[PDB]
């Protein structure tokens, strides 16, 4: 369904004008919507945690992969709606959010790479999917190359990801040299006990986790997120993280790892404290993503963590999309635009937003409280599942670090709300232009999901218990 | 109950429509036909999820 | 198994074969005679060869040391058939192997000598040449007429022998 | 009219190539002992020439059709000692 | 074994590179006459030159197309062994590549100055 | 002078327009699409009428699927 | 040992003499339509000896152009190196041959020469795509990378006859590969290396499409003339094979100098557009049809 | 249209010759393959007999060098009792 | 493997130190990929297994595609297209 | 004869060391490109020594006639219209290298007593004083080479990988076009 | 997957050991997986020959510390040109 979309897009975009980009992106938006709503019945293949191997043991298929797959389509639909649909029908918003001719094709190829990462069963398939995603994401980062701020980020991301992919390939080839194999099916309890292949898996996890940017290799991706266009940043900071973390969770190669635990604690501390030292919105959200990545990395130290990870990644994806879309909507209520690519930079520019759109500030307050973990929002429940999982395995110091990190992060989360509920006497230079109904509906749906998804907690728990056991 | 689940889903759709209207700086009763559309769509999603839940319980009970 | 590398030296072993196992004469024919007589060897000694393999897979790793006896049987059968050829059809066999050596070991360029050897063996050795796995609809490659591919140069004395035979009428 | 001066170096190249190829054919025949060369040899062919060299006593590509080999072939089998690839 | 060689070689050549790079700390401070470039004057009067995007695209796209062609070599070496299944796979491979070739033809990305 | 009539407006008119106005692309597509299509629509016909496919060639020794029989001859 | 040395010396002398004499041949052909530099340059290059790699570039490019000849056969097995990967080795040497123009453009330290080198390099790689495509198309009928193997399969029919448009495409791409019109101290090195590459491309076309050393069948002629194998018969057959191969080579050479002294020169942009808009779509069509044609009639070549 | 029709005939006649050449070469390859099939049992057994002789020779050589030392030579490095040809010869 | 690992080490440390020498950093990327391919091919030869060589050719193709993308990035970064668009629309 | 052929591999290794040092220790980008071309040649010779001449040919084809050619082409584009590249200071990043490398040395140093039972592993790793025995068998009848096996596995066992690499080559076609030309 | 295929399209060097190990794993369960330790040890030995290397090292150490002669047929090395001669 994705390969056919990619081929059809190359063919159709080849023979189309530049003005047809919005229409093509809308067409793919409804195409993916129909793919989800019409082919969703494939979840019947995974009753009682039934697992399949596809393409000569090169791919794995179970309920976990299916759910991550559907979540990636939902995120792709939201992000592509952000490109096809025009927020405001005026020339300025025309200029800021204008998709490139190849952006949708690169987006779909990156989705394909992420899915192949999630579904990988062999190191050859894993490396090929990693390279596909990496090259696609480099091209996504570089496709807006009319600024040196974006150009330096593109070049840095290319080089750092090249080093990381080389390290991943080196680890995979060391594993092959040790075992003369390219799959995890040759690893059993006896295999792990008899031979010391732990360091190979530690190196592989290191290379994979550095691609999403855990400490002490966080600064480069934070700079990249700061400097890329915000409609690009919303995508490049979610999908690769989801793919890498899902592959790491399903691989289950870091049980009670000291190195992984220490790096997770370092990631949490760096994300929490460094967020306090931020005056830019993009850097603040980058450190927020770092803290969430540390939270999810804490789940890599124990088994039977599928439910907690799935719940947390879904709620975090929804909250991430919601917060970036709130930041996008707030662009209309500022008197000047920083760059063509990043129109808002500093948190101080959101000052007094409650006097321009009080319900936008209400939605932002809901999403920020969910980030902090205020009940009964989804973020609190995800953090609670993480706490239950870590206390079931006896990680008490990890739990204390988690609680302290959340308390520290609450300060710079409430920084946003405190700035936004201030008073701005400077009235707007713009008035009464109507915001897009489709994008507003999507943002409101995300906010309502965050607010009232705790209704279906028992239903989701039962579905997990029947479809994952 | 199925009726209660449908009512809750429709109410969530109405809340989403109301929030969308208020975000756009528009009156609460702006496009009531949009309220109907949103309620119908969210009620349908709730019905699908309730059917999935019922099938899940059936599968849980059948292996006994 | 892969071939050798940049540096490799051949080391020769002069240790005697263990006395417990019996000693058997072994085939001395070079590449061309073996290529010439492979079909006859197979036709005569297929059951011994099949027993040899079946033991090789049944031993499951120790085929070299556990399947000695039928291997001795196979090499004895090969020696017997080669002795029959070397006392039976000297001329035709010499024609065939010399032509094959002169024709880069390709059976296409020596159909006349192949036919002569085949008639000799079928006439007074009670062995027939055939290629397995061929349906009756298609006709065997070695019995073709007007071939698609011609040899670069036809062998002179082989063609002379063929002409002399066809004057005799043996063919 | 046909320009012979223009075609003279072409003819020189033609004759040089012809003579070189003939000399190469003669040299290959002399090296092979009066027989044609072997081309496109696989692992099986290489093993066959190795066995033939062992049988004939190292006399090039000489072929013998004798059923019974001399006693020398019972002990002349040689294995290859590959240098360890670092 | 590769990991061991890597880990122990890191400190030695790392220190060597560290020392040889602390050397340039001060060196040729490029005090050359960089005055006409910090103002915006030109002294060429010529040597403008140009490069259409299609030229550099020909140069760059020589590489992926050459990789596409050289990927066909493994197929032609095992064409008989994988006859029909491999034939279909190669057809799909070629059609996917021709999708990109159609992209580069329709876009007219490779047409030099007209 | 010449303008594209559009493929969807008329298939055969566009085919003639491509054959007469864009020879290289038209022929490229012609030979390119002939291959798979002619294969699909002619290979069963060739198998049925012209000649059946050849028997598979051996890849290794054909191992008989049977037990070891007792043989006599060429003993020590 | 001695035989190999004599053979390689004879082949090197013959190749060098042919390359040197083709310059005179081209000059005389141009005149009718309308050497000694290596010795002086080698001492100069030795005197010069980062300057190191830049100085060693021209002669090593010439050495690569000459090594391109080590695999060219003059008969069954008649070659300096009988490589099972002769096609791949030939392709690799042809790929390496593009460095000559680039390094020669650097040699002069001149902007105009650098533009010339850039344009030449882009044209060479553009038509290297075509050459490699045609190589693989030909290999699809053989399933072997041995040059002698392909030449031997061409006994049934020359691959030119089923692929005459492919012959025309290869001829055009060969004229355009070496910047030969109308498809247009280190200088002597690069000059002889360029002409060596020209002759190598002619040889490539010869053994890919024109049948190589084959000619009319002479089995009956040898049967009439000779009654047994002899060195005279081997010499005669080698002479026949080499004469046929050399006459095909000379025909291709004459075609190259003819198009040089023929249809008017074309502009560079048109030169690349002809490869990238007209030739490559046809070659991809052939990529699709040749395996399809073999699958239709169940004629996939064996190893 | 005469040249185009002739070109189809020239290409068609070439293909017919070329297509037929491949098919017969497959048959020739089939004959060549079956020739090597029959020769394997006699060639493989000869190598197998030599392998046993060399394997025992190394075992006899090794045990005599270590005479007077408390070590086990006949004990294979592998756990199974199957025959294993010795590898990694000591440089001469 | 010695040669591949040492090439990888030297190129990795050349990358870490320069880190601002985009031409040389991208060269170091290419050489690190070469060093990994050498190790993979040596282990494939030692084990007599085809997966090592298959992954080697896959790495070759991926390295080519990566090099093409990176050189396009350098073109965009250094403005190789040139401008001379003065006195124009 | 034997003395040189026993250490051909080590000579290639030493030449590779020299070429890599010359790559990472030059100023002109041309010098680094030419030395990595030499390094690719050395890698091809090393692959030939092992018995992978086909992989050496593939390297000389791709990495040199395409990758290195494009590298030199792009650098030549930078030189005709002289645009010197600005040289930024790495002394900014030197302190982190200091800290990390001191940490790594300390990590290798506190092992101390445990090195007596770990360094020995590398000690016998360096030795490798045994020659591989090459034995012959006749279980192979088909003229199958390395490239044939590559094609077989890539077209049958891992055809999905071939299709995904087709998509990768598609990406490598689309991307340069997307970020190099200005549409309309 | 391409596992278990050699460089010539056949069965790789350690096909038998890997086959035996996977058969043992299939015939056993997770609790009884410890019984299949010798199969994995043999597979690793076929991969790297560590125990074989140690045994050869011990044999060489014993040999190099001896001065008395050896009365046993040793191994003779001959040039490639001298294969089958005499
Ligand atoms: C080869 C081997 C076979 C496979 C490939 C076959 C390709 C055949 C191409 C024929 C048309 C060639 C052509 O001239 O097209 C225009 C163009 C060049 O001509 P042009 O006039 O210069 O174009 C400029 C236009 O003016 C400007 O452009 P435009 O405005 O005319 O629009 C161009 C447009 C239009 O371009 C085309 O029309 C070309 C492609 C046509 C594909 C047709 C597929 C139809 C599938 C649905 C059929 C049923 C419909 C529903 C019916 C009711 C059911 C209840 O391009 C597209 O959007 C591409 C097609 C989109 C996807 C279509 C396929 C969907 C998937 C089908 C899966 C198969 C299911 C099998 C089920 C089996 C059941 C047992 O060439 C191409 O587009 C290249 C081929 C594209 C292939 C895709
Ligand atoms: C499993 C759980 C996962 C996710 C749960 C999320 C959503 C639940 C499912 C589906 C949600 C879809 C609902 C469809 C019903 C929504 C609906 O009334 O239409 C639209 C937006 O419509 C989407 O933009 C429809 C967007 C469809 C996709 C939404 C996905 C988020 C809202 O009316 P509206 O008053 O703005 O309507 C328009 C009116 O039609 C025009 O005539 C006027 O010119 C214009 O000003 C305005 O009044
Ligand atoms: C008409 C077809 C449209 C369907 C398209 C669905 C796209 C899903 C995309 C993005 C995620 C959004 C939330 C999905 C809810 C989880 C479903 C499930 O139950 O999660 C379970 C697994 O729970 C888990 O581990 C944890 C899940 C974490 C959810 C976190 C969000 C909580 C709030 C959401 C409550 C829903 C509000 C609906 C209001 C009417 C997968 O269930 P399953 O694999 O057995 O298949 C389900 C049957 N299906 C495919 C028809 C749907
Ligand atoms: C496989 C193909 C391999 C080669 C690929 C070549 C790539 C060319 C891509 C391309 O651009 O083609 C579309 C082309 C564009 O048209 P144009 O008017 O030039 O558009 C200008 C854009 N502003 O459009 C054209 O002008 C060409 C369209 C020609 C389509 C007709 C030929 C299709 C073949 C049908 C007949 C086949 C033979 C008979 C079969 C009978 C049974 C079905
Ligand atoms: C798209 C392609 C469609 C072409 C359809 C033409 C069919 C005409 C019928 C004649 C066949 C025949 O009668 O001659 C038979 C021939 C040869 O077989 P044989 O050995 O003599 O038969 C004996 C069968 N045994 C060996 C099993 C005993 O078979 C052919 O392969 C020849 C086909 C003609 C050339 C087609 C090439 C296609 C053009 C390629 C342009 C790129």
């Amino acid at each position: 369904m994705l390969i056919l979309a990619i081929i059809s897009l190359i063919t159709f975009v080849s023979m189309s004008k530049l003005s047809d980009n919005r229409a093509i992106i809308r067409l793919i938006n409804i195409y993916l919507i129909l793919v989800l709503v019409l082919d969703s019945f494939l979840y019947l293949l995974f009753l009682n945690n039934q697992t399949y191997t596809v393409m000569g043991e090169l791919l794995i298929f179970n309920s976990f992969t299916f759910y991550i797959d559907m979540l990636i389509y939902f995120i792709m639909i939201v992000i592509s709606s952000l490109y096809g649909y025009n927020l405001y029908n005026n020339n300025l918003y025309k200029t800021l959010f204008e998709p490139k001719k190849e952006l949708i094709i690169l987006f779909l190829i990156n989705i394909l790479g992420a899915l192949l990462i999630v579904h990988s069963n062999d190191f050859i398939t894993l490396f090929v999917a990693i390279e596909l995603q990496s090259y696609s994401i480099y091209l996504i980062t570089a496709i807006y190359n009319s600024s040196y701020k974006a150009s330096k980020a593109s070049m840095l991301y290319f080089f750092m990801g090249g080093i990381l992919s080389i390290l991943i390939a080196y680890s995979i080839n060391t594993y092959y040299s040790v075992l003369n194999s390219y799959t995890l099916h040759s690893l059993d309890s006896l295999i792990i006990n008899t031979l010391d292949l732990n360091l190979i898996l530690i190196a592989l996890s290191l290379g994979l986790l550095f691609k999403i940017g855990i400490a002490p290799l966080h600064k480069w991706l934070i700079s990249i997120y700061e400097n890329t266009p915000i409609l690009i940043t919303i995508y490049i900071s979610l999908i690769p993280k989801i793919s890498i973390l899902s592959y790491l969770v399903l691989s289950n190669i870091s049980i009670n790892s000291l190195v992984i635990s220490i790096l997770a604690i370092l990631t949490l501390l760096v994300g929490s404290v460094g967020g306090l030292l931020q005056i830019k919105i993009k850097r603040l959200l980058a450190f927020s993503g770092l803290t969430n990545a540390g939270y999810m990395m804490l789940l890599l130290l124990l088994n039977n963590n599928e439910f907690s990870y799935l719940y947390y990644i879904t709620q975090y994806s929804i909250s991430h999309l919601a917060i970036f879309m709130i930041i996008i909507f707030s662009i209309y209520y500022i008197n000047y635009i920083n760059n063509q690519y990043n129109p808002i930079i500093y948190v101080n520019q959101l000052k007094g937003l409650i006097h321009d759109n009080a319900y936008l500030v209400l939605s932002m307050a809901i999403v920020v409280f969910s980030f902090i973990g205020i009940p009964p929002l989804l973020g609190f429940f995800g953090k609670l599942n993480i706490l239950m999982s870590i206390l079931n395995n006896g990680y008490y110091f990890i739990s204390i670090v988690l609680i302290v990190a959340s308390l520290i992060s609450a300060l710079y989360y409430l920084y946003l709300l405190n700035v936004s509920i201030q008073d701005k006497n400077n009235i707007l230079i713009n008035s009464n232009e109507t915001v897009s109904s489709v994008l507003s509906y999507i943002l409101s749906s995300l906010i309502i999901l965050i607010t009232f998804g705790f209704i279906y907690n028992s239903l989701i728990i039962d579905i997990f218990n029947v479809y994952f056991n | 109950a199925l009726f209660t689940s449908l009512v809750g889903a429709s109410g969530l759709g109405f809340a989403t429509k109301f929030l969308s209207n208020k975000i756009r700086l528009k009156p609460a009763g702006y496009y009531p036909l949009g309220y109907v559309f949103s309620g119908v769509a969210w009620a349908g999603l709730g019905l699908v999820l309730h059917n999935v839940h019922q099938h899940s319980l059936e599968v849980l009970e059948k292996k006994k | 198994p892969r071939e050798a590398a940049a540096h490799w030296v051949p080391f020769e072993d002069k240790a005697n074969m263990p006395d417990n196992v019996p000693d058997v004469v072994e085939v001395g024919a070079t590449s061309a005679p073996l290529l010439s007589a492979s079909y006859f060897i197979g036709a005569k000694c297929k059951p011994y060869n099949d027993d040899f393999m079946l033991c090789r897979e049944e031993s499951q790793g120790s085929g070299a040391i556990d399947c000695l006896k039928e291997g001795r049987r196979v090499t004895r059968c090969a020696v017997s058939v080669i002795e029959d050829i070397n006392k039976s059809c000297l001329d035709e066999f010499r024609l065939h192997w010399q032509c094959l050596e002169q024709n880069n070991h390709q059976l296409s360029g020596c159909r006349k000598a192949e036919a002569l050897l085949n008639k000799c063996v079928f006439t007074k050795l009670n062995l027939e040449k055939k290629i397995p796995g061929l349906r009756p609809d298609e006709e065997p490659v070695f019995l073709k007429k007007d071939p698609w591919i011609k040899p670069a140069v036809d062998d002179f004395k082989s063609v002379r022998a063929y002409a002399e035979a066809k004057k005799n009428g043996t063919l | 009219a046909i320009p012979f001066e223009a075609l003279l170096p072409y003819g020189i190249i033609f004759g040089l190539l012809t003579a070189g190829g003939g000399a190469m054919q003669v040299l290959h025949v002399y090296r092979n002992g009066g027989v044609r060369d072997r081309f496109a040899i696989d692992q099986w062919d290489s093993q066959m020439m190795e066995r033939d060299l062992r049988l004939n006593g190292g006399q090039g590509r000489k072929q013998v059709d004798q059923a019974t080999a001399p006693e020398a072939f019972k002990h002349n089998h040689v294995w290859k000692s590959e240098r360890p690839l670092i | 074994n590769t990991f061991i060689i890597f880990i122990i070689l890191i400190p030695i050549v790392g220190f060597a590179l560290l020392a040889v790079n602390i050397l340039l700390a001060v060196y040729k401070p490029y005090n050359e006459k960089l005055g006409a470039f910090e103002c915006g004057l030109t002294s060429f009067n010529q040597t403008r030159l140009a490069f259409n995007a299609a030229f550099i695209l020909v140069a760059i796209l020589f590489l992926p197309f050459d990789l596409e062609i050289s990927t066909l070599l493994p197929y032609v070496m095992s064409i008989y062994l994988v006859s029909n299944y491999g034939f279909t796979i190669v057809l799909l491979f070629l059609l996917i590549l021709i999708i990109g070739f159609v992209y580069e033809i329709n876009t007219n990305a490779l047409k030099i100055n007209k | 002078i010449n303008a594209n009539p559009g493929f969807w407006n008329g298939p055969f008119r566009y085919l003639r327009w491509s054959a007469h106005n864009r020879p290289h692309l038209f022929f490229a597509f012609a030979i390119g699409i002939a291959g798979p299509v002619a294969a699909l629509t002619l290979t069963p016909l060739r198998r049925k009428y012209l000649y059946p496919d050849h028997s598979p060639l051996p890849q290794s020794y054909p191992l008989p699927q049977r037990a070891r029989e007792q043989l006599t001859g060429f003993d020590d | 040992m001695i035989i190999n040395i004599v053979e390689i010396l004879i082949f090197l002398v013959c190749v060098l003499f042919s390359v040197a004499y083709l310059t005179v041949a081209e000059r005389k052909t141009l005149a009718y339509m309308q050497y000694y530099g290596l010795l002086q340059a080698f001492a100069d290059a030795v005197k010069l000896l980062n300057y190191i790699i830049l100085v060693i570039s021209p002669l090593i490019t010439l050495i690569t152009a000459l090594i391109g000849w080590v695999v060219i056969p003059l008969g069954p097995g008649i070659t300096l190196g009988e490589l099972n990967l002769g096609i791949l080795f030939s392709l690799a040497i042809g790929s390496l041959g593009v460095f000559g123009s680039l390094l020669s453009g650097w040699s002069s330290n001149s902007k105009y020469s650098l533009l010339g080198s850039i344009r030449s390099t882009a044209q060479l790689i553009s038509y290297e795509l075509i050459l490699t495509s045609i190589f693989i198309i030909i290999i699809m009928f053989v399933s072997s990378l041995n040059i002698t193997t392909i030449i031997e399969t061409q006994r049934v029919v020359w691959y030119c006859i089923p692929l005459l448009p492919l012959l025309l495409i290869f001829f055009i791409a060969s004229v355009a590969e070496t910047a030969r019109p109308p498809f247009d101290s280190p200088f002597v090195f690069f000059f002889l290396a360029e002409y060596s590459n020209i002759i190598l491309i002619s040889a490539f076309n010869g053994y890919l499409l024109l049948g190589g050393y084959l000619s009319f069948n002479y089995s009956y002629l040898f049967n009439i003339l000779f009654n047994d194998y002899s060195y005279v018969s081997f010499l005669f057959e080698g002479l026949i094979n080499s004469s046929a191969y050399a006459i095909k080579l000379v025909f291709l050479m004459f075609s190259f100098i003819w198009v040089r002294a023929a249809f008017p020169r074309f502009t560079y942009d048109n030169l690349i557009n002809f490869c990238w808009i007209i030739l490559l779509p046809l070659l991809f069509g052939i990529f699709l049809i040749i395996p399809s044609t073999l699958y239709i009639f169940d004629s996939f070549p064996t190893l | 249209l005469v040249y185009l029709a002739a070109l189809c005939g020239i290409c068609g006649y070439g293909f017919y010759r070329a297509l037929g050449g491949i098919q017969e070469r497959r048959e020739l390859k089939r004959e060549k393959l079956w020739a090597r099939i029959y020769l394997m049992p006699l060639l493989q057994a000869e190598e197998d007999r030599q392998t046993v002789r060399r394997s025992i020779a190394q075992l006899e050589r090794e045990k005599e060098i270590m005479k007077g030392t408390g070590f086990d030579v006949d004990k294979s490095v592998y756990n199974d009792g199957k025959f294993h040809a010795p590898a990694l010869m000591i440089p001469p | 493997m010695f040669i591949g690992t040492i090439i990888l080490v030297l190129s990795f440390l050349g990358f870490v130190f320069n880190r601002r020498n985009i031409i040389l950093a991208f060269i170091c990327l290419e050489t690190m990929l070469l060093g990994i391919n050498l190790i993979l091919l040596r282990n494939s030869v030692l084990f007599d297994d085809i997966s090592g060589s298959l992954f080697a050719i896959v790495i070759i193709i991926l390295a080519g595609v990566e090099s093409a993308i990176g050189l396009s990035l350098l073109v965009s970064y250094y403005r190789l297209r040139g401008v001379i668009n003065s006195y124009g629309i | 004869m034997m003395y040189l052929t026993y250490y051909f591999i080590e000579i290639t290794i030493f030449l590779a060391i020299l070429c890599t040092i010359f790559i990472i220790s030059a100023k002109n980008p041309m010098v680094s490109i030419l030395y990595m071309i030499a390094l690719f040649v050395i890698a091809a010779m090393y692959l030939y020594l092992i018995g992978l001449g086909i992989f050496s040919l593939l390297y000389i084809m791709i990495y040199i006639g395409a990758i290195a050619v494009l590298f030199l082409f792009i650098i030549t584009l930078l030189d005709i219209n002289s645009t010197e590249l600005s040289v930024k200071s790495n002394i900014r990043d030197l302190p982190l290298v200091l800290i990390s490398l001191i940490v790594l040395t300390i990590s290798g140093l506190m092992i101390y007593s445990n090195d007596s039972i770990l360094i020995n592993k590398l000690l016998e790793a360096f030795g490798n004083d045994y020659n591989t025995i090459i034995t012959q068998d006749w279980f192979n009848i088909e003229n199958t080479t390395l490239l044939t096996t590559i094609g077989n596995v890539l077209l049958t066992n891992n055809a999905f990988i071939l299709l995904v690499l087709a998509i990768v080559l598609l990406l490598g076609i689309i991307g340069p076009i997307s970020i190099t030309m200005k549409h309309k | 997957t391409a596992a278990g295929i050699s460089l010539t399209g056949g069965r790789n060097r350690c096909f038998s050991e890997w086959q035996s190990f996977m058969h043992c794993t299939a015939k056993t369960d997770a609790k009884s997986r410890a019984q299949c330790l010798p199969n994995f040890e043999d597979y690793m030995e076929c991969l790297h020959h560590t125990k074989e290397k140690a045994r050869l090292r011990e044999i060489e150490s014993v040999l190099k510390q001896k001065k008395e002669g050896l009365e046993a047929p040793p191994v003779k090395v001959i040039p490639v040109k001298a294969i089958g001669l005499v």
Side-chain angles (χ1 to χ4, degrees), chain C residues 148, chain F residues 38 42 50-52, chain G residues 289-290 293 296-297, chain H residues 12 15-16 19-20 23:
Chain C
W148 280 94
Chain F
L42 271 75
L50 274 76
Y51 46 88
Chain G
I289 183 74
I290 289 305
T293 298
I296 285 161
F297 298 103
Chain H
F15 267 104
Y16 167 70
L19 283 146
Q23 318 216 45

Side-chain angles (χ1 to χ4, degrees), chain I residues 2-88:
Chain I
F2 290 92
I3 184 170
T5 287
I6 62 170
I7 294 173
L8 170 74
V9 165
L10 294 174
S11 311
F12 173 87
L13 283 189
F15 192 103
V16 175
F17 276 84
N18 302 132
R19 198 186 140 100
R20 298 153 146 61
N21 206 359
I22 296 169
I23 308 292
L24 199 151
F26 190 47
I27 284 171
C28 283
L29 286 174
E30 294 296 328
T31 51
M32 290 171 66
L33 277 170
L34 165 71
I36 281 177
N37 279 318
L38 289 183
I39 305 166
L40 192 53
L41 285 171
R42 180 214 166 239
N43 296 115
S44 176
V45 169
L46 278 191
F47 289 152
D48 192 12
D49 172 70
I50 193 66
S51 286
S53 56
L54 181 68
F55 199 46
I57 76 156
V58 167
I59 290 173
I60 297 169
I61 297 157
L62 292 167
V65 175
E66 168 183 311
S67 313
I69 289 169
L71 283 153
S72 70
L73 299 187
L74 272 71
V75 163
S76 296
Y77 198 50
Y78 298 142
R79 303 187 320 266
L80 278 299
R81 181 251 179 190
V83 64
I84 72 158
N85 291 115
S86 307
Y87 309 131

Side-chain angles (χ1 to χ4, degrees), chain C residues 1-2 5 7-16 24-34 82-83 86 93 97 101-102 104-105 153, chain D residues 34-39 43 46 48 51-52 55 61-70 73-83 85:
Chain C
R2 60 178 182 85
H7 194 121
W8 66 272
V9 285
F11 55 100
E12 182 148 32
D13 210 310
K14 64 182 181 293
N16 290 321
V24 189
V25 65
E26 61 86 20
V27 174
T30 48
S31 47
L34 294 174
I82 293 158
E83 291 179 354
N86 266 5
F93 195 63
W97 80 254
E101 213 292 323
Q102 283 287 345
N104 61 52
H105 298 220
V153 170
Chain D
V35 308
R36 298 192 175 97
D37 301 85
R38 300 293 304 283
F39 49 86
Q43 168 155 232
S46 193
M48 294 299 291
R51 195 183 167 271
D52 273 18
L55 292 173
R61 281 169 63 194
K62 186 182 286 185
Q63 310 290 289
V64 291
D65 60 340
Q66 184 57 256
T68 296
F73 195 69
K74 288 183 181 292
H75 271 55
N76 66 353
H77 187 266
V78 286
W79 272 347
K80 304 182 179 181
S81 178
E82 178 182 358
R83 184 179 182 271
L85 304 171

Side-chain angles (χ1 to χ4, degrees), chain A residues 135 139, chain E residues 60-61 64 68, chain I residues 64-66 68-69, chain J residues 166-177:
Chain A
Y135 303 160
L139 296 168
Chain E
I60 294 185
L61 285 194
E68 293 179 353
Chain I
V65 175
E66 168 183 311
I69 289 169
Chain J
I167 298 303
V168 164
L169 283 154
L170 183 63
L171 187 64
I173 294 289
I174 301 282
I177 288 177

